[PDB]
Design a protein around this ligand. Structure first.
Ligand SMILES: *[C@@H]1O[C@H](CO)[C@@H](O[C@@H]2O[C@H](CO)[C@@H](O[C@@H]3O[C@H](CO[C@H]4O[C@H](CO)[C@@H](O)[C@H](O[C@H]5O[C@H](CO)[C@@H](O)[C@H](O)[C@@H]5O[C@H]5O[C@H](CO)[C@@H](O)[C@H](O)[C@@H]5O)[C@@H]4O)[C@@H](O)[C@H](O[C@H]4O[C@H](CO)[C@@H](O)[C@H](O)[C@@H]4O[C@H]4O[C@H](CO)[C@@H](O)[C@H](O)[C@@H]4O)[C@@H]3O)[C@H](O)[C@H]2NC(C)=O)[C@H](O)[C@H]1NC(C)=O
Ligand SMILES: O=C(c1ccc2[nH]nnc2c1)N1C[C@@H]2[C@H](C1)[C@H]1CN(C(=O)c3ccc4c(c3)[nH]c3ccc(Cl)cc34)C[C@@H]21
Ligand SMILES: [Ca+2]
Ligand SMILES: [Cl-]
Ligand SMILES: [K+]
Ligand code: NA
Ligand code: NA
Ligand code: NA
Ligand SMILES: [Zn+2]
Length: 806
């Protein structure tokens, strides 16, 4: 109940909300159907419009007006934003040359530069260039401030998951807003765009920026605006808040625009009807900057112009229907559209089986425009699995397409020409970032980055300590003039052992054989030096990775590679090697085809054994340092050590072998040498974090050899490719992947063909950031370079996307 019989007199857009049955006057009251009777009359005045005119200059205050042009309005803080231009001969902010803002130039009583977040829905990265003629204010923010060519949203590329990621620094799987529509099975409750349940606090996890601010004594303007409040009124309210006394005035503010997303759905991303929404947005920015200028705040406030996601061309005809694949269509519930999430319609139906649903949806039609996954098999870069609200069965939908259950859904519920929600590496989904103000850099372009990074920077701008989040704090220090965050590298938790020769060949009963009993102090002194680490500077270019958890492991040196070998998991945590541009691929000799050799440095008890592989009819093995890339026939024997061996399904061996035989040499050729670090990953609970030993769900049959869920590789070289990878004086370049370790290649519909036709496509899909690998392995890479640590954090957050240029 709301007894709407109180009054909003003096309370218009009050900052502290009042609990019922007192009526509300806050900027969200409309949405709860709870405003005081006089809310519209008092708080939503429109009389005379939004702009001063020559005749209004000097006028007598008439409180009925939407904004004012009287002499007192500056002190009242409620002039129309164009007051000083019309009545005082000032220029519009957009007409003034830009001038570096080296320090905040704030009125007395401002304790810190305010932050204003200007968020625009559906603002596709390419609008900055393509719409530049009609967005002069935005273009000025962009060229004078700090900007990225694009900012990567999170998956799914929907509005609420992205706005709440902006606010929290968390992946949707952690913050809990995993789509625009959701079912939570613990609550037995549904979340929808339309309705009331979405305001229940239990949906919203983590700690959004306005709560972070408040808890640390920094006052926040309310972030949320009712759809019916006109943009001009939103701006005037923020400007009025900025005129409050010091003890009452917020330091952080947000504006939200429903455009261009609203018209983009209707007309598609580049429909001719899209020019006007882009003009109108620019005009709103203009009003803000003019109003800031009037208040002497245009060189004091930090302004962020940021989108939530882009917009793609999508029409009714481009829909895949599950009724064309499944006979059992009415026993499922589908969350439809630019992604698919499937669960059983009834938890009482015992005949429901996810495995037969997946099979019925896998590679069934020539150019099928969606791909089914169990959520734990989705590309790890999406970080989209660790939440009970995300259904076990997921469909990744091709850009430009929708998926739906039955045709009746699409014609009984063409309208739209645009939509979003696709894979967050898709170019059309990319959105914008511009920072302008004293704390941002001047005329500076920065590389694209992910929106999970912004929360940390917004905390930096306000002097706040960020709640724990998925940003890598420091990785965006290069956007900032001051207020950088200077982290220290994590401390190593486990120091390695350096074992020497401690076991005789006959102490090993592993069931392994090798044709290697073929026999010199010239080369005997040489091989001892290699085993002591004489070549380690060539193969370990950035220092050994640090182990950030408690475990027992050994460093093993070889001519061609160095490894950190886990006595607990019985395989390397990492293997590091360098392949120069000049290196040559050899084959595995015939006499060595099935060779596995005990490692005399590592006890039989801490070794894999070949018999388990023989007995395990499903599981085979591969090597982390590949025999193909051995530097010499003698060095090749090191590659067959039992300590270089890892469990691999034969289906996966196809992938791994092509990567090691073909692609590594190819990258060395193209990149002028590469350094490779490869290893296993164990994430059986799909939380994106390293499993402890007691979390492992699968072993090589009859043994304690744990089966990885994924294999990673990190491929590093010189950004200036005129220098070889092993002699690089400047910035690095990296690409990585986290390949799913799967017993079939069902994911790749063309896998019956030669590996040159499908393997690279699979690897591109499973591209990753080094940071993703860090979370998954508890390792910390790039510990010894000549680069600044912030630069290295930026490198670690880099994602190679394989999309063409924006
Ligand atoms: C991205 O960044 C985020 C933030 O840093 C990382 O997420 C953190 O990861 C931690 C490790 O997984 C996790 O720590 C756990 O917290 C438990 C208490 O957490 C509550 O309080 C915090 C603090 O306010 C709060 O944030 C949590 O909120 C979560 O849950 C609520 C309600 O469900 C949601 O509204 C909210 O959205 C959020 O959900 C997300 O996280 C949970 C897990 O907490 C997931 O289940 C969800 O799907 C969703 O993703 C909580 O309200 C604490 O109890 C845990 O401790 C248990 O486990 C440890 C293991 O070391 C053990 O030592 C303890 O004894 C304890 O075990 C006992 O309980 C077990 C489970 O019941 C049981 O099996 C045992 O037998 C024991 O009895 C643990 O410390 C931290 O909470 C989250 N934080 C957030 C915000 O998600 C994330 O990992 C980063 N991602 C990547 C890839 O890097
Ligand atoms: N409780 C009540 C619920 C939840 C906490 C708030 C989030 N929400 C939004 O509609 C939203 C979420 C994020 C943002 C937003 C609106 N507007 C923004 C503007 C800027 C930024 Cl960074 C984030 C957001 C509804 C309110
Ligand atoms: Ca895990
Ligand atoms: Cl959704
Ligand atoms: K086998
Ligand atoms: Na053998
Ligand atoms: Na032998
Ligand atoms: Na296949
Ligand atoms: Zn939209």
């Amino acid at each position: 109940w709301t007894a709407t019989s109180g009054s909003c007199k003096g309370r218009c857009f009050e900052l502290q909300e009042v609990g019922p049955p007192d009526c509300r006057c806050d900027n969200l009251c409309k949405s709860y159907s709870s405003c005081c009777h006089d809310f519209d009359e008092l708080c939503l005045k429109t009389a005379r419009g939004w702009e001063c005119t020559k005749d209004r200059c000097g006028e007598v205050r008439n409180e009925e007006n939407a904004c004012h042009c009287s002499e007192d309005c500056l002190s009242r803080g409620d002039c129309c934003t164009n007051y000083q231009v019309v009545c005082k001969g000032e220029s519009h902010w957009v007409d003034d040359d830009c001038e570096e803002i080296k320090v905040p130039e704030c009125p007395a009583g401002f304790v810190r530069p305010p932050l204003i977040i200007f968020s625009v829905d559906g603002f596709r990265a390419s609008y900055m260039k393509k719409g530049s003629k009609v967005m002069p204010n935005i273009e000025k923010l962009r060229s004078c401030g700090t900007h990225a060519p694009y900012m990567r949203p999170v998956y799914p590329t929907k509005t609420f998951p992205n706005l709440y990621t902006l606010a929290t620094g968390l992946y949707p799987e952690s913050h809990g807003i995993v789509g625009n529509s959701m079912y939570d099975p613990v609550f037995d409750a549904s979340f929808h765009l339309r309705g009331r349940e979405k305001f229940n606090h239990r949906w919203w996890g983590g700690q959004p920026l306005w709560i972070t601010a408040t808890k640390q004594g920094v006052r926040a303007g309310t972030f949320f605006w009712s759809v019916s409040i006109p943009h001009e009124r939103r701006i005037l309210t923020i400007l009025q808040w900025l005129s409050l006394p010091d003890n009452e005035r917020p330091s952080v503010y947000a504006f939200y625009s429903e455009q261009p997303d609203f018209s983009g759905h209707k007309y598609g991303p580049f429909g001719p009807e899209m020019t006007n929404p882009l003009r109108e947005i620019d005009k709103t920015v203009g009003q803000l900057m003019d109003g800031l200028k009037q208040l002497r705040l245009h060189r004091c406030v930090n302004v962020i112009f940021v989108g939530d996601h882009g917009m793609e061309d999508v029409t009714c005809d481009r829909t895949e229907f599950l009724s064309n694949y499944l006979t059992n269509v009415d026993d499922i519930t589908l969350v439809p559209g630019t992604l698919g999430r499937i669960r059983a319609k009834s938890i009482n139906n015992s005949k429901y089986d996810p495995k037969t649903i997946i099979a019925a949806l896998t590679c069934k039609k020539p150019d099928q425009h969606f791909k089914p996954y169990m959520k734990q098999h989705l590309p790890k870069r999406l970080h989209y699995a660790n939440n009970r609200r995300i259904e076990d069965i997921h469909l990744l939908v091709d850009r430009r397409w929708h998926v739906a259950r039955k045709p009746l859904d699409v014609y009984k519920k063409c309208f739209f020409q645009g939509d979003h929600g696709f894979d967050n590496k898709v170019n059309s989904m990319q959105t914008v970032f511009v920072g302008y103000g004293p704390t941002f850099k001047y005329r500076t372009k920065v590389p694209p980055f992910e929106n999970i990074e912004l929360y940390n920077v917004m905390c930096d701008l306000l002097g706040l300590k960020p709640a724990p989040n998925n940003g890598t704090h420091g990785s965006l220090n290069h956007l900032l003039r001051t207020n950088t965050f200077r982290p220290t590298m994590p401390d190593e938790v486990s120091r390695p052992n350096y074992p020497g020769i401690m076991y005789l060949q006959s102490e090993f009963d592993l069931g392994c054989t090798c044709d290697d009993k073929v026999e010199n102090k010239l080369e005997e002194l040489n091989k001892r030096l290699h085993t002591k680490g004489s070549t380690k500077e060539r193969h370990l270019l950035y220092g050994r990775p640090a182990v950030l958890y408690r475990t027992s492991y050994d460093i093993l040196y070889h001519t061609d590679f160095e490894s950190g070998y886990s006595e607990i998991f019985l395989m390397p945590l990492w293997t590091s090697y360098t392949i120069s541009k000049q290196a040559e691929v050899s084959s595995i000799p015939e006499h060595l085809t099935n060779c596995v050799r005990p490692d005399v440095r590592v006890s039989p008890g801490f070794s894999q054994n070949c018999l388990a592989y023989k007995n395990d009819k499903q599981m085979s093995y591969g090597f982390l340092f590949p025999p193909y890339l051995s530097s010499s026939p003698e060095a090749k024997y090191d590659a067959f050590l039992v300590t270089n061996m890892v469990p691999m399904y034969p289906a996966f061996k196809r992938v791994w072998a092509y990567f090691q035989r073909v692609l590594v040499k190819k990258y060395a050729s193209e990149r002028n040498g590469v350094n490779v670090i490869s290893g296993p990953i164990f994430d059986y609970n799909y939380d994106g974090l390293r499993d402890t030993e007691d979390e492992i769900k699968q072993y090589v049959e009859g043994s304690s050899i744990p089966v990885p869920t994924h294999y990673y590789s990190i491929i590093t070289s010189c950004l200036d490719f005129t220098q070889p990878a092993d002699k690089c004086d400047g910035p690095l370049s990296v690409s990585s992947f986290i390949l799913p370790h799967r017993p079939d290649n069902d994911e790749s519909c063309n896998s019956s063909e030669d590996e040159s036709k499908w393997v690279e496509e699979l690897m591109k899909m499973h591209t990753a950031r080094v940071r993703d690998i860090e979370h998954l392995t508890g390792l910390d890479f790039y510990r010894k370079t000549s680069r600044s640590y912030s630069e290295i954090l930026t490198l670690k957050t880099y994602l190679h996307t394989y999309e063409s240029e924006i």
